[model samples]
Target: MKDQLSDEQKETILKALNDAIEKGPWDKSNFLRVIGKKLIAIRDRFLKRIGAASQAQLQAESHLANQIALQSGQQEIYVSLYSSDGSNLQSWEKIVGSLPISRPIYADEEDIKAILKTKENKQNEAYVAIYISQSDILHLSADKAPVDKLGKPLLTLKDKSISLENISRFVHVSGVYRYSNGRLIKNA
Candidate 1:
């Protein structure tokens, strides 16, 4: 089997070899073998550093590509944006023209209430409504939203609905609450 040295082990061995060289009156073959081990240690460190650098570069390039593609109107992922009066939803249509398609523009219930009460929006609740990718909502493996004492997910929905088998299509937009007559109201 190939030798596997931990980074600490490599550093220790390299230091010892360098000390030997400095104090050397070593016989020729012993000197060559020590030098070879020193080279091996240097090579291993280089490989590890290079591997990490490449991973960083790859992630940066991927982010840039996603930005350019989105600007060019490509649908790299499904996203949901929120609205207060639901006017932004209609505005997006007139501005961007069905490019992001049916990744519905809807308000989070509490977010609407907070904006109404404060006349200001929170970080997670932008007036343009926070733009969120659909994959993010789907990847929430644990429940972050409200849950009941019966261990059922609540707050986002009115009832204790449970159907994990058909659970793949869950998106949390409850009630078509509209801003009507200077106050928010849930429309049935």
Candidate 2:
């Protein structure tokens, strides 16, 4: 049933069957069986239209999409930045580890005064909204500083002891769409 028919034949048959089904004076008693038959016929026609290699790819893609859709609602760190094309896009990476995090320091006027009064003045650049775990170090200074709406720097972790060299790239990805086999379709 899989590839026995040419694409042209499959298309013609599919169109005819779909048209007939839409115009149905449908049988109500065997409705469930009729739906199953329609699905099976559609599958056979689709398999012929997309042969073995493409068939596998389509199957895998659907599986991944389903997985991502299932895992919605979790809070994931994502990077939102402008690319060379001037398009604002975001991507995300795997979570390294969770840590005691803090809100952006510049969240209020009081926080602004505190950083300005500090003799070290290091807090000026330490405007991080959320911080990752201290156990995993990220070089905060060396990386491109993230800024919030208040024109303050955003840091990933609250631990002042850790150096900036360990900080890696940032991506804004809460979820993604992929094929079932893990082939990516889109970064969401």
Candidate 3:
């Protein structure tokens, strides 16, 4: 029955694929719209953006981040880059890998507060815990490939760690934003 069904199913699938592809002009979104939800999908979202920077005023940075996020449509709360305000970094692998894991929820403004608190209120000696949101990743001029969940390809399937060339794709999508992380000392 196994082999019998295998060949029969293969022939049936072959015919089905032939017919489906024959429709031509492949449009992924439309295709997904028709049958994607019907197929099971892993469901979730997470905050984005985490970095380190030494700056006194965060408003300007926040403004920039917000601007970028809206332009890109990667909406989510961000803790900081590596995406939070913590003062520790292990490795580039660990750093980038963490971007899309360990947490699974829409981030809140309080996330920045809680993260910064651990960094001693951005007073940590290493560097200020820098943060931004989805708004920061989509700057108008910068075209960045989505980070493919910080190298978690199986979760969705994509990133650039192998190529050293990987960072180039994501470099454009960055900025420090927060729900009022810090006040601007002077207008920019």
On lDDT, the candidate that comes out on top is 2
Residue-by-residue lDDT tens digits, candidate 1, 38-125: 7666666755664465345644775686576467643232123334444333332232222223323232434434333443432122
Question: How much lDDT does candidate 1 score?
Answer: 0.38
List candidate 3 stretches off by more than 4 Å.
Answer: 1-61, 79-100, 111-188
lDDT of 2 by residue, 47-99 (tens): 55555545456557755744553466211122222222212221111121222
TM-score of each: 0.23, 0.23, 0.23
Q: Where does model 1 exceed 4 Å of error?
A: 1-28, 61-132, 135-144, 147-188
CA-only RMSD, every prediction: 20.7, 15.8, 22.7
Model 3 score (lDDT): 0.32
| Backbone clashes under 3 angstroms, per model | 1, 27, 19
